[PDB]
Amino acid sequence: VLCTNPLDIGELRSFKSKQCVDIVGNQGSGNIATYDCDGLSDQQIIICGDGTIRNEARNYCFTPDGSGNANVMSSPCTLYPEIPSSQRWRQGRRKTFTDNGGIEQVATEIINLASGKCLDIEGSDGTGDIGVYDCQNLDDQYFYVRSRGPELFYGRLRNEKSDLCLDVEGSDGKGNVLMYSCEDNLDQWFRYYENGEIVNAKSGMCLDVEGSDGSGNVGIYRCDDLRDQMWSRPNAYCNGDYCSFLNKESNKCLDVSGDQGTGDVGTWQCDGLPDQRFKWVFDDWEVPTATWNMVGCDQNGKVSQQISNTISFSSTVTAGVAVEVSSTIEKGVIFAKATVSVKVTASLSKAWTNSQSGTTAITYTCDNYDSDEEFTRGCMWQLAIETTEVKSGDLLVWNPQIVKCTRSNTAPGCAPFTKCANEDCTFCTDI
């Protein structure tokens, strides 16, 4: 039912305008066009290994509305008799570029399997309605799944002067940022990326300075890709594990009013005082490891099984535990002795977060191998992710509804969010 073999999850953006590919409203169904990236789950696009393109708000598919140069909308996925070629997409030619945040991105044509037409934005400026059109090589026919680069750090941010935490007023992760007692609420948890964004765990929005010039009051606001939402954490400004954050637009320090570390937060001329340094506060979890478990095999037909999302742990997987685990996964995961790519860890982290508020069991059938050929025999494999909370020694095992269908009794040789390159899955593409 859901996409069991995803390749990537994130914002799908125009190479040309850098706008998000957007479904009208926030429910994950309706017309598709460009829009400002607004952090809602419908703009979390799922690139499925079966060729479909879906989203995190609703299990619907990018679909052309008819033949020829048609409009594209988010519509119900046709599953029977099979997924039609018209709801399936391949990648065409590629263009790479370094974005304003300094991250290497990879854009490609996105080409409909039925028509051979390119996903397209009306006109040439990369803004407006989205349909399918003759592939004509213009930049607005190239799309990338936005990478933030690696997650560098995460946790609450404890002030060196006051030992209070960087706080957002209330508990929804929206609004003014100020110093407050450290609390077991998610609005105090942030994740800091190579692109410079510091993203609030509760709201998914960005640490922001009022206006555009990087000087003034700090709060949480829609992530807008601007330089005043980019922060550096230079070694020079650290004192052990307490470091300053300098705004990229203004070169001013993240600052607490006065010198006691207790008041409102803004940006100000760096002054080297302890109230301008903060330490990341988080619990140690071991680097997670990914493996595949055999669910069933059939040497002379397709395999069909109930697939559940399950988690095992010594205590409750609270919102607190879940944020620790998500942030741990994003930092790095091991598969077959090697680290996986940034897009694998970003996507796995998103899958984990989206797995917390279930999740019912599905009946899944291996109709095709992960490599795309018709499944006539082989095994179904389900992902397992293991980590350990260091302070307790307690093992956490996560079995998401992520599956690989292969021709082989040998476990897949490919990490989740990468594609088996052959039927036996001995090497990989889309790493």
Ligand X SMILES: CC(=O)N[C@@H]1[C@@H](O)[C@@H](O)[C@@H](CO)O[C@H]1O
Ligand Y SMILES: CC(=O)N[C@@H]1[C@@H](O)[C@@H](O)[C@@H](CO)O[C@@H]1O
For ligand Y, the closer of residues 26 and 305 by Cβ is: 26
In angstroms, rounded to a whole number, what is the distance separating the alpha carbons of residues 273 and 357?
43
Amino acid identity at 258: G
Task: Indicate the residue among 266 and 378 with the shorter CB distance to ligand Y.
Answer: 266
Considering the complex, state which of residue 22 and residue 225 has its C-beta at the smaller distance from Ca ion: 22
Q: How far is CA 404 from CA 358, 369, 398, 411, 424, in A?
A: 21, 8, 16, 9, 11
187 binds, among ligand Y, Mg ion, Ca ion, none (CB under 5 to 8 A by kind): Ca ion
Q: How many residues bind Ca ion (CB under 5 A)?
A: 10
Nearer to Ca ion, 97 or 268 (CB): 268
The distance of closest approach from Cβ of residue 141 to ligand X in the complex, given in angstroms and rounded to an integer, is 7
**Applying CB under 5 A, which of residues 120, 160, 249, 389 lies at the interface with Ca ion?**
120
- The helices-and-strands tally (H runs, E runs) of the chain is 2, 35
Q: Does 271 bind ligand Y (CB under 6 A)?
A: yes
Is-contact 99 18, C-beta < 8 A? yes
User: Cα 58 to chain center, whole Å?
Assistant: 16
Mask of contacts with ligand X, 339-378, x by CB under 6 A? ----x-----------------------------------
Structure tokens at 210: 């009022």
d(CA 30, CA 55): 12
CB nearer ligand Y, residue 24 or residue 411: 24
For 183, the token pair is 């609390």
Total residues interacting with ligand Y, rule: CB under 6 A? 14
Q: Where are the beta strands (DSSP E) in 162-205?
A: 165-168, 175-180, 190-193, 198-200
* Residues forming a β-bridge with 101: none
ω into 316 cis (within 30 of 0) = no
Q: Of Mg ion, ligand X, Ca ion, none, which one sits near residue 265, judging by CB under 5 to 8 A according to partner kind?
A: Mg ion
Give yes or no for residue 208 binding Ca ion (CB under 5 A).
Answer: yes
Which CB sits closer to ligand Y, 50 or 275?
275
Establish if 76 lies at the interface with ligand Y (CB under 6 A).
Answer: no
Question: From the CB of 188, what's the least distance to ligand Y, in Å?
Answer: 21
- Asked if residue 272 binds ligand Y (CB under 6 A), the reply is no
3 state SS of 122: coil
- Which positions lie near ligand X, rule CB under 6 A? 8, 47, 91, 105-106, 108, 120, 122-124, 133, 136, 138, 144-145, 147, 167, 169-171, 180, 183, 185, 208, 210-212, 219, 221, 224, 343, 430
